[PDB]
Amino acid sequence: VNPTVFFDIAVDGEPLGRVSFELFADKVPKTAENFRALSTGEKGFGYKGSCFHRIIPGFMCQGGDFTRHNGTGGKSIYGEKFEDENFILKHTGPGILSMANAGPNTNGSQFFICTAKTEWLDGKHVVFGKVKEGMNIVEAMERFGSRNGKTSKKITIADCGQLE
Amino acid sequence: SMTEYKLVVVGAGGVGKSALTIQLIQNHFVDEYDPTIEDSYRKQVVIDGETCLLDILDTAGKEEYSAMRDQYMRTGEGFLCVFAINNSKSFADINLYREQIKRVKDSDDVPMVLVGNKCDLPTRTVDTKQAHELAKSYGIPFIETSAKTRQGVEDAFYTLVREIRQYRMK
Numbered sequence: 001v002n003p004t005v006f007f008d009i010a011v012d013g014e015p016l017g018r019v020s021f022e023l024f025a026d027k028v029p030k031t032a033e034n035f036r037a038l039s040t041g042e043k044g045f046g047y048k049g050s051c052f053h054r055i056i057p058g059f060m061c062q063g064g065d066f067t068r069h070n071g072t073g074g075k076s077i078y079g080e081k082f083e084d085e086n087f088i089l090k091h092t093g094p095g096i097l098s099m100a101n102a103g104p105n106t107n108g109s110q111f112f113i114c115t116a117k118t119e120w121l122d123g124k125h126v127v128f129g130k131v132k133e134g135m136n137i138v139e140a141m142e143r144f145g146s147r148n149g150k151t152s153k154k155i156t157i158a159d160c161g162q163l164e
Numbered sequence: 165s166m167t168e169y170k171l172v173v174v175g176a177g178g179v180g181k182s183a184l185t186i187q188l189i190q191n192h193f194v195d196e197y198d199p200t201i202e203d204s205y206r207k208q209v210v211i212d213g214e215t216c217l218l219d220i221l222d223t224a225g226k227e228e229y230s231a232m233r234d235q236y237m238r239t240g241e242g243f244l245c246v247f248a249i250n251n252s253k254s255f256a257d258i259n260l261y262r263e264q265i266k267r268v269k270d271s272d273d274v275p276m277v278l279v280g281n282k283c284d285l286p287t288r289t290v291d292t293k294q295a296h297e298l299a300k301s302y303g304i305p306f307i308e309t310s311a312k313t314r315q316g317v318e319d320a321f322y323t324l325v326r327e328i329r330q331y332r333m334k
């Protein structure tokens with residue numbers, strides 16, 4: 001059954017709120033497992049302490065670079081990169097959780113949370129989850145973004161883990 | 165009060181638009197790849213003895229977002245059209261950028277410079293003789309550059325400024 005994970009988001013170190021996500025292991029098991037394990041930290045590395053480096057209001061919040069903390073890094077539990085598992089799931093609206101990448105078959109750890117329907121990303125980014133609780137937290141995160149994505153405060157995953 | 169010039173750097177993904185701009189602005193060569201969303205920089209320089217203020221827009225090389233280029237093409241005063249000498253598709257793409265600029269600005273003689281980047285590389289795929297011929301067909305300069313070694317970087321930007329200056333003196 002599909003795992004649920006959470007992030008506790010902070011703004012310059014001050015708690016903002018919790019976002020939880022259902023991970024669609026029933027459709028993208030390999031991609032869901034990567035995000036689940038990175039959320040628990042059980043491999044010895046993962047999302048805890050990392051930041052949302054790119055927030056563009058009207059589109060998405062992107063994060064997951066826990067290796068370089070500059071928007072260029074990240075790694076998967078399978079190695080540096082892994083293949084696009086499938087494109088069964090689509091970018092249908094706010095709350096969609098999907099993999100960032102540098103072209104075909106370059107998934108690592110970077111991900112994005114949609115704040116709107118981004119259907120032109122279908123077939124380029126592997127969708128693998130959706131916000132359950134705390135969409136209002138994701139909406140609140142947009143005030144810290146900008147047109148090119150540069151954030152005006154440090155938006156971090158202060159804690160993260162698995163709930164179900 | 166100094167004369168201002170709005171420059172826009174365009175071209176296919178990965179050709180070195182940001183590497184060229186960052187060389188001019190920050191005096192270093194970005195080895196890593198960090199694909200651009202959109203960035204703006206300001207710098208004062210002296211060209212042929214006249215001080216001027218460059219506003220430089222560094223754009224994304226993402227063909228799926230071509231419709232988003234119109235707005236910055238309307239605002240821009242001169243365009244660096246960049247290809248890479250090891251990327252034949254990027255040289256083919258130049259024609260599309262030139263025609264989009266001409267269409268969006270409704271103007272036959274927008275200030276432009278054709279830039280062939282990555283000339284430090286030990287091999288290549290683009291015949292630069294074709295670049296000279298293309299630039300001639302457009303009536304614009306062709307400049308070879310390497311953002312890695314800084315060769316030609318100042319020349320590319322300053323040449324575009326000279327093209328804008330000549331346009332304003334028409």
Ligand SMILES: CCn1c(-c2cc(N3CCN(C)CC3)cnc2[C@H](C)OC)c2c3cc(ccc31)-c1csc(n1)C[C@H](NC(=O)[C@H]1C[C@@H]1C)C(=O)N1CCC[C@H](N1)C(=O)OCC(C)(C)C2
Pocket residue numbers: 054056059060062071072073099100101102110111112118120121125147148198199200201202224226229232
């Ligand atoms: C034209 C201006 N522009 C725009 C854009 C597009 C529109 N449209 C309006 C009309 N509709 C129908 C179409 C779209 C409007 N306004 C803008 C922006 C606000 O104008 C400044 C985008 C964009 C993306 C890139 C470059 C320029 C770009 C880019 C550059 S690297 C990239 N994408 C993909 C990115 N890889 C990485 O980070 C790699 C480095 C790591 C490992 C990636 O996996 N993800 C996840 C998915 C989202 C994507 N990042 C991203 O940030 O998308 C931004 C977005 C705003 C959604 C699209």
Ligand SMILES: Nc1nc2c(ncn2[C@@H]2O[C@H](COP(=O)(O)OP(=O)(O)NP(=O)(O)O)[C@@H](O)[C@H]2O)c(=O)[nH]1
Pocket residue numbers: 175176177178179180181182183184194195196197198199200201223224225226281282283284285309310311312313
């Ligand atoms: N050898 C060499 N590599 C270069 C040169 N210019 C850029 N590169 C390299 O090519 C890659 C892409 O460069 P970058 O400037 O990011 O390209 P871009 O045109 O801005 N890409 P985008 O459209 O996605 O923003 C980087 O790894 C960079 O170091 C050059 O003159 N020589």
Ligand SMILES: [Mg+2]
Pocket residue numbers: 181182183198199200222223224
């Ligand atoms: Mg760039």
